[PDB]
């Protein structure tokens, strides 16, 4: 069979219908089969797993670091071949996922330097694009191609030249959609052409495209309709769907408007579970 679980940030995966009050914020939502691989990823980047009816049923992975926390979550049979990782700094790494799969509890996939963390995962896709953004909205686009499978001691490589005050808060693949949804954490939305952000080599400093101070958390392609799964700080996890048609075209110099009305609660996650 399977079973349906919210992994959270601190490690616990619990199925959906059975979240407590008191919890870390939710990660994604997957429904696993009992035949499957779960894999978690951390900031430290780190990679835990289980398998299996009775691990479903209720876990927490033991996380090998003080302040250790999930950034992404897959099944593995349900997941590319190669693994894309983004860091704080602006790294970008490249790992197949036989390097690593079904290894020990915790096993470290990629070398940090002083200070950086893992922000975000993505599942590989050749021939595509990159698109690398940071919290103050500048976005990096580059082919896929630029970042050279590697083996778990690797650091990989610059993705994107940081300003000062800037992080990196996540990557995205680009396949050929016209359209992107510029996400803030405070729930404002516009959609932008993909030809706002012009394809360059990879280190570059990027394109400014969300046209506030609110943090850029994601920059969704779209190409007719998308369905998220989006969580928050406070503890929710709700889905939306939104057709292209339903927002009016804006450029990289829009302000986004509000869609979620979120008060004193952030977006922290945005999940793409359809897209046509």
């Known amino acids: 069979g399977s079973i349906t679980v919210a992994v959270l940030q601190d490690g616990s995966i619990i199925p959906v219908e059975e979240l407590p009050l008191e919890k870390a914020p939710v990660v994604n939502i997957l ?5 499957e691989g779960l894999f978690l990823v951390s900031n430290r980047g780190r990679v835990y797993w289980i398998a299996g009816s009775q691990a479903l049923q209720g876990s927490k992975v033991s996380l090998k670091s003080r302040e250790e926390k999930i950034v992404g979550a897959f099944i593995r049979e349900k997941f590319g071949n190669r693994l894309l990782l983004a860091t704080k700094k602006g790294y970008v790494k490249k790992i197949p996922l036989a390097e690593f799969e079904y290894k020990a509890q915790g096993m470290p996939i990629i070398k940090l330097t002083e200070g950086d963390e893992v922000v975000s995962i993505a599942s590989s896709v050749d021939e595509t694009h990159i698109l690398l953004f940071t919290k103050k909205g500048r976005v990096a686009r580059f082919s896929v191609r630029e970042v050279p499978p590697s083996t778990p001691g690797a650091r990989g490589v610059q993705g994107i030249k940081l ?6 808060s996540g990557l995205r693949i680009w396949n050929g959609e016209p359209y992107l949804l510029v996400i803030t954490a405070k729930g404002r939305v516009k959609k932008i052409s993909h030809e706002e952000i012009p394809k360059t080599n990879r280190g570059v400093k990027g394109t400014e495209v969300s046209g506030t101070k609110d943090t850029l958390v994601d920059l969704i392609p779209i190409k007719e309709e998308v369905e998220l799964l989006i969580t928050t700080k406070n503890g929710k996890a709700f889905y939306d769907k939104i057709n292209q048609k339903d927002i009016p075209l804006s450029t990289k110099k829009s302000i986004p408007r509000t869609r979620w009305k979120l008060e004193d609660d952030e977006i922290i996650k ?6 046509e």
């Open 270 to 275: 945005v999940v793409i579970k359809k897209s």
């Open 163 to 168: 300003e000062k005050n800037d992080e990196t």
């Open 31 to 35: 429904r696993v089969p009992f035949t």
